[PDB]
């Protein structure tokens, strides 16, 4: 038994809720929150900018030190850093950027990072809101992640669409 509340069950191990991941993190304080990162750990908008803002920029300060030491992540890769005031740990995961021409198959590699953690609070990666992109993003999550993942979907029309379309 864990502390996540109000989630719909998609499969044995995947749960979903129309929620803002930042509000979910503050309320639950999970062991792992996933950030939808870029390779530079530049947290400007979306999940990353909102998580970072909620840490009062401490996530960005830690991230810049990480990059200065280690260089950029790989697309499809990840690193574990502090969760600051939001979680014990933040797993920064880089999904492919299709508007950069980055291979859509890297999305499966990105989700494979989740399997190194028993339970995670996470957003959809390389999904966005419009088109078939988000549907297929959740399809890859379900078919790749084997650990217990609690998905917070910010857009309610998208949440409703995902639940109603999920096979
Ligand atoms: O939900 S979406 O339509 C699926 C793709 C999307 C892109 C923007 C950032 N998103 C978030 N997801 C969950 N919590 C969030 N808090 C702040 C942003 C955010 C994910 C929106």
UniProtKB/Swiss-Prot annotation:
Bilayer topology: Multi-pass membrane protein
Subcellular location: Host endoplasmic reticulum membrane
Reactions this protein catalyses: Thiol-dependent hydrolysis of ester, thioester, amide, peptide and isopeptide bonds formed by the C-terminal Gly of ubiquitin (a 76-residue protein attached to proteins as an intracellular targeting signal)
Signal peptide region: none
Description of activity control: Inhibited in vitro by GRL-0617.
Domain Macro: 1-167
Source superkingdom: Viruses
UniProt-reported outcome of changing residue 31 to A: In strain: Mu/B.1.621
Functional summary from the UniProt entry: Responsible for the cleavages located at the N-terminus of the replicase polyprotein. Participates together with nsp4 in the assembly of virally-induced cytoplasmic double-membrane vesicles necessary for viral replication. Antagonizes innate immune induction of type I interferon by blocking the phosphorylation, dimerization and subsequent nuclear translocation of host IRF3. Also prevents host NF-kappa-B signaling. In addition, PL-PRO possesses a deubiquitinating/deISGylating activity and processes both 'Lys-48'- and 'Lys-63'-linked polyubiquitin chains from cellular substrates.
Subunit organization: May form homohexamers. Interacts with N protein.
Protein name (record): Papain-like protease nsp3
Biological source species: Severe acute respiratory syndrome coronavirus 2
Chain's gene name: rep
